[PDB]
Amino acid sequence: ATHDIAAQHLADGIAASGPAPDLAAAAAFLEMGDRLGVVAHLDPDRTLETAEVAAALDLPEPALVRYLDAVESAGLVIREGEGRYRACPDFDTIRHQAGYISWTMNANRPFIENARDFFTDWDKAARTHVRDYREVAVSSQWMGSHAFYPTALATIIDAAPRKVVDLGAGTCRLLIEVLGAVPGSTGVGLDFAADACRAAEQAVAQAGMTDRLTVVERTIQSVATDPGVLEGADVIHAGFVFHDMLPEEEDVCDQVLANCRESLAPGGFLAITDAVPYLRNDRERRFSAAVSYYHGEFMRRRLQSEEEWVERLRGAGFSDVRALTLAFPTGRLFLAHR
Amino acid sequence: ATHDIAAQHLADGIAASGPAPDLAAAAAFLEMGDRLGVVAHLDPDRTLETAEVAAALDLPEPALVRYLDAVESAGLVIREGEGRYRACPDFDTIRHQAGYISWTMNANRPFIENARDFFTDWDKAARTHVRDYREVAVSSQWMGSHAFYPTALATIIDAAPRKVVDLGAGTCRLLIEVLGAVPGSTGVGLDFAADACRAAEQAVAQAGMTDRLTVVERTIQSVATDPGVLEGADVIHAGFVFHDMLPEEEDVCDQVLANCRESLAPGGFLAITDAVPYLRNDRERRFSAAVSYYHGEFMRRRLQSEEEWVERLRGAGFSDVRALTLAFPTGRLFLAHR
Ligand SMILES: CC(C)CC(=O)C(=O)O
Ligand SMILES: CC(C)CC(=O)C(=O)O
Ligand SMILES: [Cl-]
Ligand SMILES: [Cl-]
Ligand SMILES: [Mg+2]
Ligand SMILES: [Mg+2]
Ligand SMILES: [Mg+2]
Ligand SMILES: [Mg+2]
Ligand SMILES: [Mg+2]
Ligand SMILES: [Mg+2]
Ligand SMILES: [Mg+2]
Ligand SMILES: [Mg+2]
Ligand SMILES: [Mg+2]
Ligand SMILES: [Mg+2]
Ligand SMILES: [Zn+2]
Ligand SMILES: [Zn+2]
């Protein structure tokens, strides 16, 4: 008998768990590896040399090997001879899916663990339980690799601009790839962070485009008063940067949008990626609500609907505004034409 | 044009993300809610009354309502009139799947965030970065609801015992349900924790079985020298308790297993659930490796293969040992007959 009862429970249990064990394990292995610096050396097209990577990362090589042997058992890498490991063929998709888990469970963990304090004294909780910006940045890039970054890339590229401006450039990755794909164009990577700009500047020298790529280390709010760098841009790009100005700096935000419209060359457009609040459709609703609740309740940053965004961009002077659904749940791309 | 490029990127992005956004959001909402005490009041068959639950949980009712309105938007609960919410029909499956994410990303977070310290000075890291046992316990119960708990329940029930002994009872939930399903039987819930035993004892009075259910507050290692409580048991149950004795207390472990064999009534068996290390098959391997790496590398607790378990149980005197694959990846149920 016992063989048969355990047989149905096994089948029923397999169905109930579904893909969650796999994703749970992938997310933990990949966050742990990324914190160690290992994940950046894993790629499906080349091998990681443990002897060299352990020295680059200042890890004891036996400890690094035990880690890679665990993720090899997990099936996320392939051992290609002693001391060499290569990521599994679909590694980048697995890493992308882990970005969602890392964002809600790791980047936003202070909100998960301390919700009571936020409900009691939001001001004290907001400056006591703060997010790790490196985890926010990495999980966002993982989520963006397949869910919003390619749409922006292909859109800017297709317009074939000659002057691109990226508000909140950070890594400057978007600029390097639009310059390397459209000939003769130039780019400007505005970003306030010192940390994001030294690492960006050297990668500008890496590609060898320092003549075409300016990096100014100012805030995006500085555009409201000093919109000089924008002059003549064919595409101005803004990825998930505007909602941090709302609702506290709405006037500055509306001024930056109006300066953006004024400063575009004819036929140019402003391409904004951002998150709309609490969608209802079955695909997007669950992650939408997580993005919306984290922002509304814990960060008190205003997410705007498509209607609000369209009205705000048309009040900034833009003739026509197109909204494009992104694969990233609750993410929208707004193309605001001059 | 831009409509069409964004159309393929959307479809491609939807495929790449798959179920990860949904699970990411579900896990964060449900861990946050469980930490608040809310999740225990959510059930698909009855409503949560915000006015009363906010008082029971000592939360400001407006804050609780904003939380439930977010998870309602997420689709995890249904508003059934003002102030009343009911969990979505498949809530228990979603909660089960979130148990895997909560276990690897939350319960085991000290290992994710501090792997460098463990690689450098394991002894210092092991007592510096310790897991939250409440999160370990809750995520384990969520994982077990559909992946290993029903198999043990149905197995013990089907044997129709008259004396059941649960090593590491903790919640005493397993005992209450085997006593409530087989008539005239008695149970013993051995567990070292004071915290786990006061809450268990009152629930014994809740069901009204305090005459049939003994609760002794001893360690399972105390069975190696004092196996008195086991005498005459038809089923002895041990859920994920033995690997914490290995490899440091192997002699005590082998003594408990031998005392278990000796103490069984004729036809009785010892039912052990535990985790085998690093499986290779495609379904189990990824989560297997996570369970195995957390235990081997960070907790230094020995997981045994089916072969090692069979040999150890036969060395303890058991005539025949059956191994049963559980839905819980890398989980196995061993039935060791007298
Ligand atoms: C929604 C993410 C893409 C980034 C973000 O806005 C945040 O984490 O605050
Ligand atoms: C494998 C889990 C079921 C429990 C466990 O063994 C642990 O978290 O240490
Ligand atoms: Cl004009
Ligand atoms: Cl005998
Ligand atoms: Mg089952
Ligand atoms: Mg099945
Ligand atoms: Mg499954
Ligand atoms: Mg290691
Ligand atoms: Mg979703
Ligand atoms: Mg895409
Ligand atoms: Mg598709
Ligand atoms: Mg999808
Ligand atoms: Mg709230
Ligand atoms: Mg698995
Ligand atoms: Zn944000
Ligand atoms: Zn364990």
Answer whether A78's CB lies under 8 Å from A86's CB: yes
Residues in chain A after which the chain is broken, C→N over 2.5 Å: none
- A residues 139..198 contacting B (CB < 8 A): 146-148, 150-151, 154-155, 158
Distances (CA, A) of A125 to A170, B3, B105: 27, 43, 23
Amino acid at residue number A315: G
Q: Phi and psi of A59, rounded to 5°?
A: -115, 150
b/e map A228-240, b = 16+ CB within 10 Å = ebbeebbbbbbbb
Mutation probe of ligand 1 site: the residue of A291, A304, A332, A333 with most atoms within 8 A of C-beta: A291
* CA dist., res. A108 & res. B327, Å (int): 30
Give A177's contacts (C-beta < 8 A, 6+ positions apart): A153
3-state secondary structure of B335: strand
The token duo for B311 is 């040999």
Contact A116 B285 (CB under 8 A): no
Q: From atom 7 of ligand 1, which residue's Cα is the shortest distance away?
A: A136
Could you please report the per-residue DSSP string of A253-290? Answer: HHHHHHHHHHHSPTT-EEEEEEE-S---STTTHHHHHH
User: How far from the centroid of its chain's Cα atoms is residue B60's Cα?
Assistant: 31
Q: Phi and psi of B264, rounded to 5°?
A: -70, 140
Farthest CA pair distance, chain B: 80
- Say if A91 is an interface residue toward chain B (CB within 8 Å): no
Contact A16 B326 (CB under 8 A): no
Could you please report the per-residue DSSP string of A189-235? Answer: EE---HHHHHHHHHHHHHHT-TTTEE-----SGGGTT---TTTT-SE
**E strand or H helix at A318, and its extent?**
none
- What is the end-to-end Cα distance of chain B in Å, rounded? 74
- Mind listing the domains of chain A with CATH numbers? 148-337 (3.40.50.150)
* CA dist., res. A108 & res. A131, Å (int): 6
* Of B299, B302, B233, B242, nearest in space to B265 by CA: B233
Contact A20 B280 (CB under 8 A): no
- Which parts of B148-263 fold into alpha helices (H)? 149-158, 173-179, 194-207, 250-263
Strands B213-214 and B186-190: parallel
How many Cβ atoms from other residues are within 10 Å of residue A58's Cβ?
9
Contact B2 A100 (CB under 8 A): no
Distances (CA, A) of A249 to A239, A244, B31: 18, 9, 33
Contact B25 A290 (CB under 8 A): yes
Answer whether B213's CB lies under 8 Å from B189's CB: yes
How many Cβ atoms from other residues are within 10 Å of residue B79's Cβ?
14
b/e map A73-105, b = 16+ CB within 10 Å = bbbbbeeeeebbbbbbeebbbbbbbbbbbbbbb
Length of chain A: 338
b/e map B290-321, b = 16+ CB within 10 Å = bbbbbbbbbbebbbbeeeebbebbeebebeeb
- Which parts of B37-164 fold into alpha helices (H)? 50-56, 61-74, 91-102, 109-113, 115-120, 122-128, 133-147, 149-158
Q: Phi and psi of A134, rounded to 5°?
A: -65, -40
Identify any residues that bridge with A189 across adjacent strands, giving them in sequence order. A166
* Of B263, B164, B270, nearest in space to B209 by CA: B164
The token duo for A91 is 């590694």
Residue A119 Cα to ligand 13 midpoint, Å, equals 6
Residues of A in Cβ contact (< 8 Å) with B29: 289-290, 293
- A residues 242..301 contacting B (CB < 8 A): 278, 280, 282-283, 285-290, 292-293, 297
**E strand or H helix at A324, and its extent?**
strand A320-325
Answer whether A112's CB lies under 8 Å from A135's CB: no
- Say if A116 is an interface residue toward chain B (CB within 8 Å): yes
Q: Phi and psi of B185, rounded to 5°?
A: -85, 165
Strands B235-239 and B186-190: unpaired
DSSP state for residue B240 in the 8-state scheme: S
Within 13 A of A15's CA, how many CA atoms are on the CB side? 6
Chain A closest-CA separation from residue B327 CA (Å): 5
DSSP state for residue B265 in the 8-state scheme: P
3-state secondary structure of B154: helix
Question: What's the burial of B141, exposed, middle or buried (CB within 10 Å: 0-12/13-18/19+)?
Answer: middle
b/e map B177-207, b = 16+ CB within 10 Å = ebbeebeebbbbbbbebeebbeebbebbeee
Q: From atom 5 of ligand 1, which residue's Cα is the shortest distance away?
A: A240
Question: What's the burial of A273, exposed, middle or buried (CB within 10 Å: 0-12/13-18/19+)?
Answer: buried
- Say if B12 is an interface residue toward chain A (CB within 8 Å): yes
Length of chain B: 338
* Of B34, B66, B30, B73, nearest in space to B50 by CA: B66
* CA dist., res. B236 & res. B265, Å (int): 10
Q: Phi and psi of B125, rounded to 5°?
A: -65, -35
Could you please report the per-residue DSSP string of A34-101? Answer: HHHT-GGG-BTTBEEEHHHHHHHTT--HHHHHHHHHHHHHHTSEEE-STTEEEE-TTHHHHHHHHHHH
DSSP state for residue B223 in the 8-state scheme: G
Give B311's contacts (C-beta < 8 A, 6+ positions apart): none
Answer whether B186's CB lies under 8 Å from B163's CB: yes
Question: Could you identify the atom of ligand 1 that is nearest to the CA of residue A144?
Answer: 3
Distances (CA, A) of A174 to A148, A199, A220, B161: 12, 14, 17, 67
Task: Write the secondary structure of A305-317 as one string of H (helix), E (strand) and C (coil).
Answer: CHHHHHHHHHHCC
Could you please report the per-residue DSSP string of A129-156? Answer: S---HHHHHHHHHHHHHHHTHHHHHHHH
How many Cβ atoms from other residues are within 10 Å of residue A191's Cβ?
23
**E strand or H helix at B6, and its extent?**
helix B2-17
In which residue are the tokens 């191994």 written? B323
Answer whether B96's CB lies under 8 Å from A13's CB: no
Answer whether B327's CB lies under 8 Å from B146's CB: yes
3-state secondary structure of A164: strand
User: How far from the centroid of its chain's Cα atoms is residue A116's Cα?
Assistant: 28
Answer whether B107's CB lies under 8 Å from B135's CB: yes
Amino acid at residue number A243: H
CA dihedral B199, B203, B204, B207 (to 10 degrees): 180
State the resolution, in angstroms: 2.1
Would you put residue B149 in left (φ > 0), alpha (ψ -120 to 50) or beta?
alpha
* CA dist., res. B204 & res. B198, Å (int): 10
- Which of A116, A283, A292 to mutate against chain B (most B CBs within 10 Å)? A116
Question: Which strands make up the sheet holding B213-214, listed edge to edge?
Answer: B213-214, B186-190, B163-167, B235-239, B269-275, B331-337, B320-325
The token duo for B114 is 């501090």
